[PDB]
C-alpha cells in the first residue's frame, strides 16, 4: 500500500506478460513520487512491452539524465532507442552501461553485438575475448546467434548453445511424451517466423511446392509465429501446406496446438534467433525434433534429437561438436526458390556504379563485415586499379566507418557503393551488375550466397572450421566449383585479384556458373524433394513408423 512495493509489483507483473495490471502500478508509483528516475524509467518500460517505443525513449532519456550513473536505466534506454530505430544513440547507452558494469556479461554481449552491427570496431578484440570467456565459464548471457560473429571454434559454440538450452530446459516441464504413428501419412511440422519475406520462407518455398507435388505421403504443416505480411511467399507457402498462424499464442499454447495435430517430426527453422520461441521446443510437443537450415550450428539442446546438414558444411570432422545426432542430405543442405525470374536492373549509373570497372560485392548484413573480411576485400581493390566494392547499406554511421576504414587502409572511399534496402525482386536484380561476390569469414553469406549464385554471380569463400563458416563452401562444392574455395586470406585475395584483372577468365567463370546452375542438383528442387522426403521416411521408420 506504499511504496517501492508499487514499482516492485510492476516489475513482475510486466515481464510475466500481464501489462496493465502492470501499468496500474507504475502510475501509482508516480502517485507517491512524481517523476522519479526509478519510476519514470518504468513508465518508459511499459510503453516498450506495449509496443509504443517512441514514447519510451523520451521517458527513459529523462530518467537517464537525472541518473547518469544508473546502469539498469542505461540498459533500458538502449533497448528503447534501439526499438525506436536510433541505432547510434542506442550503442551510446550500451557503452555507458558497460562503463558502469564491467563484469556484467549480459551487458558486454549486448554491446559487442550492437557494435558489430555498426562496424564500430573499437576495442573489439577485448570485447570478443570477454564474451567468449563468459561462454567458457557457463554464464552465457551470450545469445548464440550473436555468438556466430565471433571467431570461436565449434567447441565454444557448442558450449554457448548447451549453456542457454540448459537454462531454458530447467525452467520448463515437458508435455507428456508421445510417439511417432505406426500407420498413416507422416505429419511433418516446421516452426518459424520466417514464413513470408524472410530468408526461411525464401529458401523453402519451392521445396514445399515440390514436396506437395512429389511426396504425397508426407503431410506438411507450417507453424507460423508471424502474421501474414502480404508477400507472395506467404501465399505460396500457405498454398503448398497447411499453414497455422500461431502468432501471439503462448509457448505453452503453441506446443499444445502442435501436439493437437499429432506432428510426428517437428523441424525448428527458427532457430536461436529473434522470434525464436525455443521454450516451445523444450516442451517436446513432437516425438522427434529436428534442427535445420535456419540456425547454422548446434542447438545445444537435449530436446533436440537430430540436425540436418551435409557432407561438406558438416563433415564427419565436425560431428562431435553437435549435441544432435547428425543427418545429411545427398547434396547441399540449403534449398532455394528456383522459380525466381531475375529481373533486369536499372543501369549502373542508376545503381550508383561507374560504367567501366570490375564490381566486387558483398551483401551480407553489417555484423558479418568484420575487420578481417573488410581488410581482405579492400586488399583486392588496391591491386585492381578500376575496381569497386558494392555493399549493403547498414544502420547508423556504419557506412561512414567503412569509408573511414577504407581510407585508413589506403583506398579511395568513393570506391565503395552502398545499396539501400530493397524488396527481394529488385535486390536480386542488382546481381547482374556484379562481377564477383566476396564472402565473409567466420560468418558466411547464407541466403545471399544462394541469391548470388542463382542469378549467376560466382562466390569466393574461405571454408572455415565451423558450420556457419562453411555454408558458402557447401554450395561451391556441391555445384562443382571447388576452385572458389580457397585455403586462406592470402589465397582469397590472390584468387580474386587474378579473376578481376583477367576479364577473359572472369567471363569464362560466369559462363561456367551458368552451366552448373542448370546441370547440378543444387538448384533442382524436385531432386531435393525426393532426397528430403526419402530421408524423412527413413528417419520415421528408424522411430517406429510402419508406412502406408
Ligand X SMILES: CC(=O)N[C@H]1[C@@H](O)[C@H](O)[C@@H](CO)O[C@@H]1SP(=O)(O)OP(=O)(O)OC[C@H]1O[C@@H](n2ccc(=O)[nH]c2=O)[C@H](O)[C@@H]1O
The nearer residue to ligand X, 203 or 220, going by C-beta atoms, is 203
CB of 336 to ligand X, least distance (A): 10
CB of 366 to ligand X, least distance (A): 8
According to the annotation, is 257 in a ligand binding site? Answer: yes
CB of 384 to ligand X, least distance (A): 25
The nearer residue to ligand X, 368 or 403, going by C-beta atoms, is 368
φ, ψ of residue 235 to 5 degrees: the values are -60, -50
Buried b (16+ CB within 10 A) or exposed e, 59-83: bbbbbbeebeebbbbbbbbbbbbbe
d(CA 442, CA 318): 15
CB of 229 to ligand X, least distance (A): 10
CB of 241 to ligand X, least distance (A): 20
Grid cell digits, residue 74? 542505461
Contact 292, 536 (CB under 8 A): no
Query: Would you put residue 75 in left (φ > 0), alpha (ψ -120 to 50) or beta?
Result: alpha
Which residues is 419 bridged to in the sheet?
A: 392
The nearer residue to ligand X, 321 or 427, going by C-beta atoms, is 427
Residue 393 CA, chain-centre distance (Å), reads: 17
The nearer residue to ligand X, 42 or 198, going by C-beta atoms, is 198
CB of 450 to ligand X, least distance (A): 8
For residue 462, count CB atoms less than 10 angstroms from its CB and return exposed for 0-12, middle for 13-18, buried for 19 or more: buried
CB of 508 to ligand X, least distance (A): 27
The nearer residue to ligand X, 86 or 364, going by C-beta atoms, is 364
Which residues is 189 bridged to in the sheet?
A: 221, 266
Q: Among all residues, whose Cβ is closest to ligand X?
A: 447
The nearer residue to ligand X, 330 or 447, going by C-beta atoms, is 447
Angstrom CA distances, 510 to 78, 338, 357, 503, stand at 45, 18, 16, 10
The nearer residue to ligand X, 98 or 198, going by C-beta atoms, is 198
Count CB neighbours of 517 within 10 A.
17
In 259-408, which ranges are E strands? 265-268, 288-292, 306-310, 325-329, 359-362, 388-392
Question: Strand, helix or coil at 52?
Answer: coil
In 378-462, which ranges are E strands? 388-392, 416-419, 436-438, 459-460
CB of 427 to ligand X, least distance (A): 3
The nearer residue to ligand X, 166 or 365, going by C-beta atoms, is 365
The nearer residue to ligand X, 39 or 146, going by C-beta atoms, is 146
CB of 113 to ligand X, least distance (A): 10
The nearer residue to ligand X, 196 or 287, going by C-beta atoms, is 196
Which residues is 438 bridged to in the sheet?
A: 460
Strands 186-192 and 242-245: what pairing? unpaired
Contact 265, 180 (CB under 8 A): yes
CB of 132 to ligand X, least distance (A): 21
Nearest alpha-carbon partner for 157 in 166, 168, 146: 146
CB of 195 to ligand X, least distance (A): 11
For residue 461, count CB atoms less than 10 angstroms from its CB and return exposed for 0-12, middle for 13-18, buried for 19 or more: buried
The nearer residue to ligand X, 472 or 500, going by C-beta atoms, is 472
According to the annotation, is 244 in a ligand binding site? Answer: yes
Residue 244 CA, chain-centre distance (Å), reads: 23
The nearer residue to ligand X, 378 or 392, going by C-beta atoms, is 392
Query: What residue has cell string 559454440?
Result: 157
d(CA 15, CA 410): 50
For residue 428, count CB atoms less than 10 angstroms from its CB and return exposed for 0-12, middle for 13-18, buried for 19 or more: buried
CB of 82 to ligand X, least distance (A): 12
d(CA 499, CA 436): 9
Note the residues at the interface with ligand X (CB under 6 A): 198-199, 202, 363-365, 392, 421-422, 424, 427, 446-448, 451
Which residues are CB-neighbours of 511 under 8 A, at least 6 positions away? none
Element (H, E) at 223: strand 218-224
Indicate the annotated binding residues for Mn(2+): 244, 257
Q: Binding site: which residues?
A: 244, 257
Amino acid at each position: 500500500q506504499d511504496f517501492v512495493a508499487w514499482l516492485m509489483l510492476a516489475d513482475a507483473e510486466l515481464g510475466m506478460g500481464d501489462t496493465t495490471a502492470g501499468e496500474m502500478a507504475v502510475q501509482r508509483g508516480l502517485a507517491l513520487h512524481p517523476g522519479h528516475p526509478e519510476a519514470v524509467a518504468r513508465l518508459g518500460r511499459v510503453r516498450w512491452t506495449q509496443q509504443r517505443h517512441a514514447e519510451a525513449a523520451v521517458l527513459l532519456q529523462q530518467a537517464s539524465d537525472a541518473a547518469p550513473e544508473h546502469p539498469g536505466i542505461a540498459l533500458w534506454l538502449g533497448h528503447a532507442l534501439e526499438d525506436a530505430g536510433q541505432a547510434e544513440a542506442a550503442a551510446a547507452a550500451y557503452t555507458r552501461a558497460h562503463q558502469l558494469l564491467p563484469e556484467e556479461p549480459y551487458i558486454t554481449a549486448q554491446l559487442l553485438n550492437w557494435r558489430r552491427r555498426l562496424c564500430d570496431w573499437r576495442a573489439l578484440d577485448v570485447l570478443s575475448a570477454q564474451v567468449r570467456a563468459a561462454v567458457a565459464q557457463g554464464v552465457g548471457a551470450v545469445e548464440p546467434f550473436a555468438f556466430l560473429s565471433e571467431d570461436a571454434s565449434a567447441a565454444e559454440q557448442l558450449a554457448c548453445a548447451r549453456t542457454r538450452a540448459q537454462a531454458i530446459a530447467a525452467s520448463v516441464r515437458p508435455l507428456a511424451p508421445t510417439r511417432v504413428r505406426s500407420k498413416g501419412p507422416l505429419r511433418v511440422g516446421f516452426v518459424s517466423n520466417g514464413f513470408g519475406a524472410h530468408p526461411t520462407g525464401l529458401l523453402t518455398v519451392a521445396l514445399f511446392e515440390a514436396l506437395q507435388r512429389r511426396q504425397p505421403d508426407l503431410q506438411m504443416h507450417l507453424f507460423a509465429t508471424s502474421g501474414d505480411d502480404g508477400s507472395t511467399l506467404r501465399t505460396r507457402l500457405a498454398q503448398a501446406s497447411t499453414l497455422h498462424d500461431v502468432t501471439a499464442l503462448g509457448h505453452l499454447a503453441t506446443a499444445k496446438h502442435i501436439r493437437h495435430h499429432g506432428i510426428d517430426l517437428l523441424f525448428d527453422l527458427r532457430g536461436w534467433g529473434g522470434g525464436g520461441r525455443p521454450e516451445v521446443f523444450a516442451l517436446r510437443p513432437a516425438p522427434v525434433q529436428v534442427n535445420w537450415l535456419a540456425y547454422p550450428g548446434t542447438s545445444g539442446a537435449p530436446w533436440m534429437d537430430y540436425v540436418l546438414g551435409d557432407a561438406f558444411a558438416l563433415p564427419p570432422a565436425l560431428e562431435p561438436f553437435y549435441s544432435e545426432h547428425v543427418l545429411r542430405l545427398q547434396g547441399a543442405f540449403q534449398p532455394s526458390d528456383t522459380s525466381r525470374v531475375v529481373a533486369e536492373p536499372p543501369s549502373r549509373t542508376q545503381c550508383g556504379l561507374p560504367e567501366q570497372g570490375v564490381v566486387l560485392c558483398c551483401f551480407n548484413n553489417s555484423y558479418k563485415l568484420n575487420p578481417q573480411s573488410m581488410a581482405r576485400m579492400l586488399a583486392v581493390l588496391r591491386e585492381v586499379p578500376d575496381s569497386v566494392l558494392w555493399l549493403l547499406s547498414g544502420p547508423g554511421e556504419a557506412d561512414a566507418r567503412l569509408r573511414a576504414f577504407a581510407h585508413a587502409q589506403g583506398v579511395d572511399a568513393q570506391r565503395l557503393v552502398f545499396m539501400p534496402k530493397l524488396p527481394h525482386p529488385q535486390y536480386l536484380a542488382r546481381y547482374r551488375h556484379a562481377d564477383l561476390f566476396l564472402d565473409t569469414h567466420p560468418y558466411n553469406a547464407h541466403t545471399t550466397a544462394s541469391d548470388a549464385l542463382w542469378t549467376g554471380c560466382p562466390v569466393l569463400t574461405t571454408p572455415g572450421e565451423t558450420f556457419a563458416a562453411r555454408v558458402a563452401g557447401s554450395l561451391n562444392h556441391h555445384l562443382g566449383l571447388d576452385e572458389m574455395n580457397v585455403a586462406d586470406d592470402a589465397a582469397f585475395v590472390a584468387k580474386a585479384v587474378a579473376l578481376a584483372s583477367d576479364p577473359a577468365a572472369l567471363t569464362a567463370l560466369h559462363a561456367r556458373v551458368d552451366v552448373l546452375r542448370r546441370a547440378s542438383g543444387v538448384f533442382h528442387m524436385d531432386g531435393f524433394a525426393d532426397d528430403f522426403g526419402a530421408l524423412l521416411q527413413a528417419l520415421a521408420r528408424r522411430h517406429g513408423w510402419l508406412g502406408i
